Design goal:
heterotetramer; A: 608 residues; mainly beta; Neuraminidase; 2 domains; 1 helix; B: 123 residues; 7-stranded mixed beta sheet; 4-stranded antiparallel beta sheet; binds a molecule of 4 linked components (NAG-NAG-BMA-MAN); binds a molecule of 3 linked components (NAG-NAG-BMA); binds a molecule of 2 linked components (NAG-NAG); binds 2-acetamido-2-deoxy-beta-D-glucopyranose; Low-density lipoprotein receptor-related protein 6 (chains A, C)
Chain lengths: 608, 123, 608, 123
């Protein structure tokens, strides 16, 4: 086929033929605001581009159709992006999030490859035929690093360089090319960073770089042009096209720049998800974020135990492993003001309250199958009874505890009352009780009641100011609460005995609690931190992540024991009850009702 | 003016579903109500629009013959009757309104009010 | 010359040649969001368009140069627009504001021509060679009206029609064309609205419309096309171009559609501002809004006395005349949250406080020569001493009365107290005193003091809750305040005697006062009303305008008698005082200082 | 980040004027500060921009040779030195900032912060 040049500028991606050296024509795209980096897949006739203003990476055919946004979440400044044409993978570097990530060319199986000790990666270049990837860094000390295309064996390749841009590989002659924006030079070296050469030292403002055959191409923001010169001497210079202000990136669309081969190019290396190249010309199978590679070194298993913490407009996931894998944001759409979260381990769906929309919503961790459970009212906190498939939530407007099935059908109200101000809530269906904070005027309380609203008991009425968070661990028989005004975290038995302060120092605004294994996690909204303490008392209080803005809630997810779940007497058709199924101290069950109904003489049904 | 969509849920291939858009704070006699949909990783797409005063309806080619937009004579509510649902019809369906009658109804930028959207999944 | 068709669609105005093979090419414009109506001036090679989204009417050459927004204020839905190519005037119709307006083609001398009993005008067509003006109305009963192009002789031309669109005049054959959007027809009548004929009754969805030679052109939103047919029989139909969705307006750019002549084209009728055509082929001279035509019927005089009333993001002007001219919004840019307004009748400049920017700004009624006088701080109210050229304003943050020269040079603080809360303020430099409300906690007061802060006297301390507005009339010796809590407006002498309640019923939230001569105007923010009462007693309480949202202040402007102004002893260079010039009871002057200075032995200067 | 312009006034033709842009929440090690102008009835026009870290300056053709953009070394303030002022230089001058280096500095839509602007009128 014929080679042509593609360049990005403003919200346009245009084509310049090299048969005519003119014929400027735009690629018919829509929805583009600020096109930045560019790449292509010649066998698919597809182009790829990042949008710094929209925080997206997208793709489409040259014709203009099949326009897809393959990366929409978790981006801040996606300056670098490159296509793995052999393994059919998309790589990118985010200067804001300080991450090198990979995914399929359609966006599936997104994984983080570099995240430790990485300060502002900019340009990115891939060598899949050999298994190396190269990127520039605008960190504290700018440099050019190299690593295997699975993120391993990272190393510094060129330490003595300014803030480089347009990193380009000459695959025929084994040379790296880049533009030093701090010294305004076009430089070069071999693939190990040695034999530095200055290609052009008299250019006013070079920016963006590519290479094809005997020539290098660059854009000059001062001369507002795209130019070309002999790749070795730097002479034989010529103007390709002028009057082009602030051209961000250039490349030569031709098959001769996407050559080579690896085993990922033939049946994806028998990998179930990611086939990632490693030196020399080899490959390793990869998995999505927080997934683990199986013993066959080919297939991937989803995480069974993880942490969930929410912000105002985001819900994130975090695992606890030896690798210390980075936290990710879940692709949940239309998050406005998340107030609390919960998780159903049976159907593996995430629940949350949005205070601006005043709804309780549900979705899969990948964002699909969104559903509104309850939608004036103001849901405050929620807690799921996974055995009876109920949601216990408090209404800030009507001051009630309302019970709703997972499919949205209302069960009824189990707590209403003069003076009552129910807020935080946690259910303990293993014992048949619920625990909630009662923020009555100038007399806050932590109360307990049966899951039908009966057996009301005030557990604590002193040493409280604004108890705002609640957690519970049924196996240990412990209740946990955090007081945002008094700035401390306390604990007690489920009976209410043995009240003790766990932490009361270096805590500004605790607004969430959860229990992992023997650790008590909490979030400090003002300190922007997640911390944890060892409830066995052996290890000390540790920070786990900082600089997290607008923290809202935190919730731990344990792998569901199917056997222990099916042994709960309300797990099988609600124990015969039409509404509320209550576990007794015997281990057997009762049936009860919300407050607008009454239990009939069959001791199982509720009638008005 | 506030708008609230409802009616989205999981539904089989070839099945039917009716969405509704409750409206508040106006008589909407000067308004155009339009429906948009946005699938993950795709641009927002125009579906249908209707004049509250006049009854003129406008449809995208991808929903012609299958989707019908209508108006309630009683409760300030616009409906979107969706028949012969394909898997590609899976998206979050948004309700939009603008106090102007004759304009490019596919131009989503010029609408004045939007709802929260409701999710329609088709297997 | 060559004829070609221009059409609007989305944010683009495009060109189609009628002689050549249809070469659809876009006019290189910028900043367009939603182009709707279109017109042109062939002798200028200029095009004009309205933007409904941006609420503007703009102009540019066919090459895109000299892009100008000639109308930027006071627009809501500018659907109709037409170019007077003989008198070089711009006409437009706004469906929202319910107004037909005129101005020069560059935007100068904007005037309202039709505003009384006008319900939603849509399309607009001009016939300046004859002096007539035609427009369609989408009001309660749709019809097509006619009037002279100065706004007079308004009449109904076609009463029996639906909501018409694309009103077009066949100047050669004396017929009107329009599209009835309610019956989906293309109709035609003569210039008298009689001899109705249906040109095309089988079209799916016609919208835009224009006429050229033997042809009519129209856009069809159902067929997504621009089509053409014989203007008489409706036969010989053809498609000019398809695949054009929702084309708003069309026109033929050719000199054959801008013929004729009148006296405005030869000498502008020797009018100083506007030359407006009237039947039959004559002209009359017009003036900008609120200007008056002198006895020579050629020159225009600016309004000498008028009323100013401000909203949150607007400052408006209003006069009192026989024809009852409409109120206009002054082209003041960057208004965010206007709290109070004032006016210097000497240099004829407008002053106001913007509570969001927290500054005191100044400009003319042109909007030009903007200047910030005061720039944390929180100005609340202001009152201008027009003789000493000072501004007396209260600071809500520091609770002081601060004085500042008109050019921004600070004079100093004249009042400050431990528990003082000075808010509303009005200056009486003819007597040497100022009046201000003191909103102390649960003890609101109306106080008086000399213009230097001495002789503090509480005039009233009972019958008040939230005295929020103040006004003063020096010839009558009367003080006026309005209580927003007690919902009444009172009056008293400057001494403090004869306190009387003027109105105390049907008043929700009075937040402003002013005096014209014998009338006391006020604004009710909650009722969105401007009302007035007669102080001499002959007439009763009347409304002057309704449905005005977010009212903030109101201020009357009286024509300044310069010889009486120069007789004030502080008008001649502050009477020799370096700071505060005080009129004493005998008519002579005294010098004083702000509180951080002291008067020196020379009895004229102040030093630290 | 909050910006506040100052220095605008009335100046003769051919005179000189220096504008300044104050700063708050000084994240300026990663910011580009640009100047924009807007005359009445005209589109907003790019003037000049500067990299706070780096020192690179960029100018419009209508102000080359006459205008100069600079940084303060102790104040967190960008200056716009305006020499050889023409009457058509009359406009409200706006100071804009964006937490990014190297982009189309004339693209006013992508800047993140703006000031209230200051009025410069040239006779
Ligand atoms: C557009 O549509 C027209 C029909 O609506 C096309 O036909 C033209 O029609 C005229 C008459 O309407 C015919 O021309 C001649 O008419 C005279 C009589 O002329 C007098 O009467 C007519 C009608 O009352 C009036 O308009 C005149 O001013 C006169 O007062 C006959 O004696 C001739 O024999 C001849 O018929 C033609 O049919 C035609 N005119 C032409 C071809 O010049 C018209 O052709 C269509 N135009 C296009 C461009 O397609
Ligand atoms: C507890 O939460 C449930 C929802 O989970 C609330 O039920 C909702 O209550 C409203 C008003 O009581 C119902 O609206 C009504 O619908 C009927 C049609 O059935 C209509 O005729 C009425 O005019 C009114 O619009 C709504 O349908 C219902 N929703 C469900 C799913 O049951 C309940 O009100 C909450 N309880 C408290 C005390 O807040
Ligand atoms: C009454 O209004 C005047 C302005 O009309 C206020 O004067 C302003 O006062 C501030 C300080 O409070 C001045 O800022 C100062 O600038 C000098 C440099 O000249 C600097 O050395 C100081 O450290 C301080 O930053 C400001 O320039 C001045 N403005 C004018 C036009 O004089 C006055 O503060 C107001 N009174 C009260 C009680 O607030
Ligand atoms: C858009 O360009 C693509 C790229 O060819 C076309 O989509 C497919 O292209 C492959 C070749 O890579 C063909 O084998 C397929 O048949 C194409 N798909 C379809 C549905 O035709 C597509 O044809 C182009 N679109 C237009 C309108 O030209
Ligand atoms: C764009 O067109 C306008 C109008 O055609 C040009 O402005 C003037 O046009 C007249 C003729 O109509 C010439 O006599 C003048 O010399 C033109 N003005 C100037 C300053 O040259 C305008 O020049 C055109 N602009 C471009 C870039 O082509
Ligand atoms: C580039 O320059 C080298 C000399 O350094 C020369 O040998 C080579 O032929 C040149 N190539 C082209 C394409 O001009
Ligand atoms: C390129 O450069 C070298 C020497 O400067 C030489 O081969 C030749 O003259 C130049 N031009 C071309 C077109 O090769
Ligand atoms: C997986 O990899 C390890 C080390 O790379 C290797 O020792 C092991 O044999 C591999 N697993 C299988 C099933 O081959
Ligand atoms: C169609 O147009 C021709 C001219 O091209 C005209 O003479 C003829 O009368 C028209 N025919 C009809 C049926 O309108
Ligand atoms: C102006 O016109 C009015 C009426 O149209 C007339 O009474 C008056 O005499 C005219 N004055 C002049 C100077 O033409
Ligand atoms: Cl303790
Ligand atoms: Cl961290
Ligand atoms: Cl544009
Ligand atoms: Cl004439
Ligand atoms: Cl107006
Ligand atoms: Cl530079
Ligand atoms: Cl500098």
């Amino acid at each position: 086929p014929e080679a042509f040049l593609l360049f990005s500028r403003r919200a346009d991606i245009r084509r310049i033929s090299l048969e005519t050296n003119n014929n400027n024509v735009a690629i018919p795209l829509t929805g583009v605001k600020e096109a930045s980096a560019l790449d292509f897949d010649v066998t698919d006739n597809r182009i790829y581009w990042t949008d710094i203003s929209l925080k997206t990476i997208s793709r489409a055919f040259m014709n203009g159709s099949a326009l897809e946004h393959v990366v929409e979440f978790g981006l801040d400044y996606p300056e670098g992006m490159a296509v793995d044409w052999l393994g059919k993978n998309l790589y990118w570097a985010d200067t804001g999030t300080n991450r090198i990530e990979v995914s399929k060319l359609d966006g599936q199986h997104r994984q983080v490859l570099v995240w430790k000790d990485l300060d502002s990666p900019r340009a990115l270049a891939l060598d899949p035929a050999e298994g190396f990837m190269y990127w520039t860094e605008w960190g504290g000390k700018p440099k050019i690093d190299r690593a295997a295309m699975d993120g391993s064996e990272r190393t510094t390749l060129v330490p003595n360089v300014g803030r480089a841009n347009g990193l380009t590989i000459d695959y025929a002659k084994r040379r790296l090319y880049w533009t030093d924006l701090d010294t305004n030079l076009i430089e070069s070296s071999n693939m190990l960073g040695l034999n530095r050469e200055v290609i052009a030292d008299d250019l006013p403002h070079p920016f963006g770089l590519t290479q094809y055959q005997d020539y290098i191409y660059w854009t000059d923001w001062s001369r507002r042009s795209i130019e070309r010169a002999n790749k070795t001497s730097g002479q034989n210079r010529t103007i390709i096209q002028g009057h082009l202000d602030y051209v961000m990136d250039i490349l030569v669309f031709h098959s001769s720049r996407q050559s080579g081969w690896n085993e990922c190019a033939s049946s994806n290396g028998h990998c179930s998800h990611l086939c990632l190249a490693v030196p020399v010309g080899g490959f390793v199978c990869g998995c999505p974020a927080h997934y683990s590679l199986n013993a066959d070194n080919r297939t991937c298993s989803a995480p069974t135990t993880f942490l969930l913490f929410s912000q105002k407009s985001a819900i994130n996931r975090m695992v606890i492993d030896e690798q210390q894998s980075p936290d990710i944001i879940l692709p949940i759409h239309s998050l406005r003001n998340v107030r609390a979260i919960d998780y159903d381990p049976l159907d593996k769906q995430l629940y949350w309250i949005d205070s601006r929309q005043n709804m309780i919503r549900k979705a899969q961790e990948d964002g699909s199958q969104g559903f509104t459970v309850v939608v004036e009212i103001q849901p405050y906190d929620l807690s799921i009874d996974i055995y009876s498939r109920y949601i216990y939530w408090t209404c800030e407007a009507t001051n009630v505890i309302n019970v709703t099935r997972l499919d949205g059908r209302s069960v009824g109200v189990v707590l209403k009352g003069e003076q009552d101000r129910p807020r935080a809530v946690v259910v303990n269906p293993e014992k048949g009780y619920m625990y909630f904070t009662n923020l009555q005027e100038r007399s806050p309380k932590i109360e307990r009641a049966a899951l039908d609203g009966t057996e009301r008991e005030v557990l604590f009425f002193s040493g409280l100011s604004k108890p705002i968070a609640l957690a519970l661990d049924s196996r240990l028989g412990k209740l946990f609460w955090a007081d945002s005004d008094l700035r401390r975290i306390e604990s007690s038995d489920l009976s209410g005995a043995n009240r003790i302060v766990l932490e009361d120092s270096n805590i500004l605004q605790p607004v969430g609690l959860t229990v992992f294994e023997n650790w008590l996690y909490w979030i400090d909204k003002q300190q922007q931190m997640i911390e944890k303490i060892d409830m066995t008392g052996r290890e000390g209080r540790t920070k786990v992540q900082a600089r997290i803005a607008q923290l809202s809630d935190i919730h731990a997810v344990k792998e569901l024991n199917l056997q222990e779940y099916r042994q709960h007497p309300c797990a099988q058709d609600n124990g015969g009850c039409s509404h509320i199924c209550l576990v007794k101290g015997d281990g057997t069950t009762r049936c009860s009702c919300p407050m607008h109904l009454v239990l009939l003489q069959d001791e199982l049904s509720c009638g008005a | 003016v506030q708008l609230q969509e409802s009616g989205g849920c999981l539904v089989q291939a070839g099945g039917s579903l009716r969405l509704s858009c409750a409206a508040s704070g106006s008589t909407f006699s000067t308004y155009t109500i339009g429906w948009f949909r946005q699938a993950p990783g795709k641009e927002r797409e125009f579906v249908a629009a209707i004049h509250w005063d006049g009854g003129q309806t406008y449809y995208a080619d991808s929903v012609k013959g299958r989707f019908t937009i209508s108006r309630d004579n009683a409760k300030n509510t616009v409906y979107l009757q969706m028949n012969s649902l394909k898997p590609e019809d899976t998206a979050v369906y948004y309700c939009a309104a603008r106090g102007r009658r004759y304009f490019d109804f596919t131009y989503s930028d010029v609408y004045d009010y939007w709802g929260q959207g409701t999710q329609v999944t088709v297997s």
